[PDB]
């Protein structure tokens, strides 16, 4: 119950949240980019044949 101790403990928790939030943000952004790339590739493949 030291005045510094229950502050050090909260300092421990106040950084894993930031780290995990960054990780989830990166995962979401990468998934969105991959989906967009797959969609554009399929669209181009479909688009060539009708022109020909």
């Amino acid at each position: 119950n030291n005045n510094y101790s229950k502050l050090r403990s909260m300092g421990y928790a106040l950084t894993g949240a930031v780290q995990t939030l960054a990780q989830i943000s990166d995962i979401n952004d990468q998934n969105l980019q991959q989906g967009i790339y797959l969609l554009r590739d399929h669209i181009v493949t479909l688009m060539e044949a009708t022109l020909h």
């Binding site: 960054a22 943000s25 990166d26 980019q33 967009i36 554009r40 022109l51």
Partner: protein, 53 residues
């Protein structure tokens, strides 16, 4: 000569060439390959967040 009139023989063109006229549809989708090429190179840039921090 006498009562009958005489006319010169007519020369004839030896060959003819046939070049029929064709309708012009003027479709616009063809010769648009450049737009497809532009679609190919979208190049979305994403920078990892948290690696720097």
């Amino acid at each position: 000569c006498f009562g009958v009139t005489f006319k010169k023989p007519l020369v004839a063109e030896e060959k003819t060439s046939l070049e029929p006229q064709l309708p012009h549809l003027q479709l616009r989708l063809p010769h648009l390959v450049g737009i497809i090429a532009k679609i190919k190179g979208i190049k979305i840039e994403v920078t990892s967040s948290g690696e720097s921090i």
